[PDB]
Structure formats: C-alpha cells, structure tokens
Design a protein around this ligand. Sequence first.
Ligand SMILES: CCCCCCCC
Ligand SMILES: CCCCCCCC
Ligand SMILES: CCCCCCCC
Ligand SMILES: CCCCCCCC
Ligand SMILES: CCCCCC
Ligand SMILES: CCCCC
Ligand SMILES: [K+]
Ligand SMILES: [K+]
Ligand SMILES: [K+]
Ligand SMILES: [K+]
Ligand SMILES: [K+]
Lengths: 260, 250
Amino acid sequence: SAINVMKWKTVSTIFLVVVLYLIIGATVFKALEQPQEISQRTTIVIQREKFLRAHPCVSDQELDELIQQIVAADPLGASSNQVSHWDLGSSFFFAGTVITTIGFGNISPRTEGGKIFCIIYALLGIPLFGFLLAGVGDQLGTIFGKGIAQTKIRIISTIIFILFGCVLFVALPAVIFKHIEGWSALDAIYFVVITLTTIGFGDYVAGGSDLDFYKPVVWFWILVGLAYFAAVLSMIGDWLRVIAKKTKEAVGEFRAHAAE
Amino acid sequence: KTVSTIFLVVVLYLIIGATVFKALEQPQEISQRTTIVIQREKFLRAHPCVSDQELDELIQQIVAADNSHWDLGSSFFFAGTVITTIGFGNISPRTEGGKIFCIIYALLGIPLFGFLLAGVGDQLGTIFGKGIAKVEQTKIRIISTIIFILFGCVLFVALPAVIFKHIEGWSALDAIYFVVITLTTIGFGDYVAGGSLDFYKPVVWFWILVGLAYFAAVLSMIGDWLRVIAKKTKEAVGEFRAHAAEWTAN
Ligand SMILES: CCCCCCCC
Ligand SMILES: CCCCCCCC
Ligand SMILES: CCCCCCCC
Ligand SMILES: CCCCCCCC
Ligand SMILES: CCCCCC
Ligand SMILES: CCCCC
Ligand SMILES: [K+]
Ligand SMILES: [K+]
Ligand SMILES: [K+]
Ligand SMILES: [K+]
Ligand SMILES: [K+]
C-alpha cells in the first residue's frame, strides 16, 4: 500500500495547484469585470430614478416587481406574433446540446416531463455521443496520418497539425459566425472556444438570434471541432506534465545546490 | 467506417429527442407566451399614465440590463465553472480582456482540472475497491455493480439533492434535475446553487469535485452497456438474416 501513499501525495498537490490556479483566475476576472459592473450598476439606477421621476404615477414600487416580472422573460405590441424556441429545428439543436454536454442553456425545459426526459436523454446520449466523437476523432486522426506521411520531424508535424486545426475549425467558422450572426472578431473566436471546449456559457449562441442551411453545418461543425479540441486539450495536458515534472527536477536541484 | 455509421444512429437519437422535446415544451411555451401578453395589457390599462411607448423603452433597457456578481468569491466560482467545462453562464465575461483571459484560462485549466479529477477518481475508485473487495462468482459482478450504482446515487444524487431542496428552495425534481445537469458537465444555468458566506458554496464545489468523478464512472459504464447491447443486437441481426435466408431456400 506504499503506492497508494505515493498517489495521495500527488493528488493532494494537484488539488493545491488547482486551488492556486482558481484563486489566480478569480482575482483576474474580478479585476476585469468589477469596473464595468459598478458602472452599469450605477447607470441602471440612474435610469430607474429618471423614469420613476418621469412617471411617479405607477405604484412606484411595482417597477421593481415589474422588472422581476420581466426577468421572467429571461413581446411588444409591435410583433405580438413570434416564432417558437421549441420548433421543429431548435429542439434538435437542444437535443444536441444535451448529448454534447455543451448546454448553452439559452432555452431550457420547463415541463416536469421535459426535465425528466432530459435527464434520461442525457444519461443515454452522453455515452452514445462519446462513441460518435471517438469514431470521428479516429477518422480525422487517420486522415491527418495519411497526409503527414526523427523527434524533430514529429514536432514539426504537430505544428502543422495545430495550424490547419485553427484554420479549419477556428478561423473559418468564426469568420462565418462573424458574417451571418453579426459578431465581432473576438466574439466569434470567443464563441468557438467556449463551444468546442464543451463549456457553453450561452452568452453567445449560433442558433439563438432570430438560412436553415446554417445550422446543419453548425452542429456538424460542432461535432468535428469537438474531435479537434479533444486532441488539442490532450496535447496541452501532455505539455503540462512535462513542464510540471521538469519544474520538479529544477526545484529539487535548486534546493540541493543552494548556490554551492 | 461501417462502425462509424454510429453518426446516423446519433442523428436518429437526436431527431427522436427533438420530436420529444417539442412534444414536451412547445405547449407550455404557448401558455407562458400568451400569459405574458395578458400581463402587458394588464399594465397599460391598469396604469393609464404609462403608454405604449414608455413600455417599449422600458423593455429595451431591461433587455440591455440582461447583459453582486464577480465579487471576491463569485469570480472563484466562475473559474470553477470554466475549468470543469460546466459553464452555467449565470455570470459570463463581458470585458474584451476578460474574454481573452477566459479563453486562455480555459485552454490551460481544462487539462489541469482533468489531472485533478483523474487523481480524485483513482483515489475514490480505490476507496470504493476497499469496500467492495470485502462485501463481494460470475453472477456476483452484476450485484457488485448494482451496489456501486445504488450507494453512489445515494451519496452523490440523493443526499445532496435533499440538501439543495431544503436550503436552496427547489423541488425534488428540480434538485435531481440540477444534480444531473451539473455533474454531467452540461450546466444549462437555469438552476444554479450559488447563482441566485463561505460555507454553503465550498461544500458544494467539493461535492461537485467528487460527483463529477462519480458520473464519469457512471457514464463510462453506460457506454459499456451500450457497447454490449450493440454487439448483441448485431449478432441477433446476423441470426435473423441467416434463418430468413434458410427459410427462403426452403
Ligand atoms: C501558477 C502557480 C505556479 C507555481 C505552482 C505551485 C508551486 C508550489
Ligand atoms: C511537490 C511538487 C511541487 C511542484 C510545483 C511545480 C511548480 C511549477
Ligand atoms: C432507442 C431505440 C433506437 C433504435 C435502435 C437502433 C438499432 C439500429
Ligand atoms: C446499435 C444499436 C443501438 C441501440 C441503442 C439503444 C439504447 C437505448
Ligand atoms: C412526466 C413523465 C413524462 C414522460 C416522458 C417520457
Ligand atoms: C467521502 C465520501 C463523501 C461522499 C459525499
Ligand atoms: K454549459
Ligand atoms: K450554460
Ligand atoms: K468533459
Ligand atoms: K462538458
Ligand atoms: K457544459
């Protein structure tokens, strides 16, 4: 049971590194988001007061319960007639979000039957889509293997892999998203990263804004791009332990010599 | 590539799910969307000083309000959602540098968290191994897997959902719904435990840490069950065609 002691040491150290990494990212995001927050938090109260004052004739407090009744929309007399969010197409993009575990959450089920089905549908879809993604990844890895046909040559081959990768699966689809969805250059690249890393905040969605040839390419862009980041995230993880183990040899060697 | 036709089965599984969700969600959509129209007209008539016009400006500036959070701790939990690939989206980055940092922070954190979760999973798999090597011939393997899934759904689904039901104010289904959506790394964000003061939220993120390793094992077994079912349906298709050809010969 000595190897179990050796495992628990490594596990606890990784968890201490993860916490540090989380603390670092925490401080950086809040040092990047708190400023625009407080500006918006004060300029929304300016608009509250300047439209309570212009119209004190509401039962003034209901503005806040009104806003609550509007955060439930999370309509107007103009275009009181819309299209669905669970139409013949969006439900098949939402079934895709469930099995891919990207879960943008822009439209989530509200029926108890829908919630229970979504649970069973995920528990069966996540493994099934895993076999699909594995088959697609093996297929594309052999397409790359055919096209690439000692250690220095294989580093060059990994470089040209990552290059065509960001070209086909990052550059081109982001430009397509920038064109049709009307996003910026960063918003497109941000959307590509958040989608194919299976994070999917839902702040940007390709099928959210209201050609029907658009989407069949989207979910099958998503399918193959997931195989791509799967390889890329695996290479990044491999890079992390190589750096991690050689920083461990350097610290042990640093300490040991102690400037002679 | 004949095996790679799983694609087509996945597309069916999607088309099937599609027809089910629109048969489960588009109805109440209409009920909700017609009960919103009634509310608006109930607000212009009941408040005649507010006109058609002031309402539109109000709705616009609140849809803009859709775009305290990022506090000393909520940014830590955002980072937790980033590396776990759960990404509730309840609080998303808006700064240009915040977006780029979020990109880089994910590309580097997701592998790191993968190593952590792998270490926690191996550690918990051996903790499980100690208990079951004691409680646990060919048939017994099924009972052992039953005891795994049974006692795991207790610790990582039942008990934390009851905790969420009481404390967070959800239903039994909303709790179980949240548990699955979270620990399957899907995370729509419709329900978030700490999305709606340093003790409820770290206990959850430690739960999340260990429950992810739990569903990871559960999802892998289910995939293995699917593999067994698929091979045994293939051998049954070969049986059916073989005797159907037998019969045609007769
Ligand atoms: C990002 C942290 C770098 C050092 C890792 C922890 C060293 C103990
Ligand atoms: C005991 C192992 C510590 C490793 C820290 C590495 C920092 C880059
Ligand atoms: C859930 C039922 C799917 C039908 C099985 C597919 C056999 C080719
Ligand atoms: C190859 C046949 C797939 C059957 C899947 C059924 C899962 C309920
Ligand atoms: C409430 C149960 C709904 C059934 C969906 C398969
Ligand atoms: C040590 C097991 C914890 C289950 C929640
Ligand atoms: K998500
Ligand atoms: K989300
Ligand atoms: K994952
Ligand atoms: K995921
Ligand atoms: K996700």
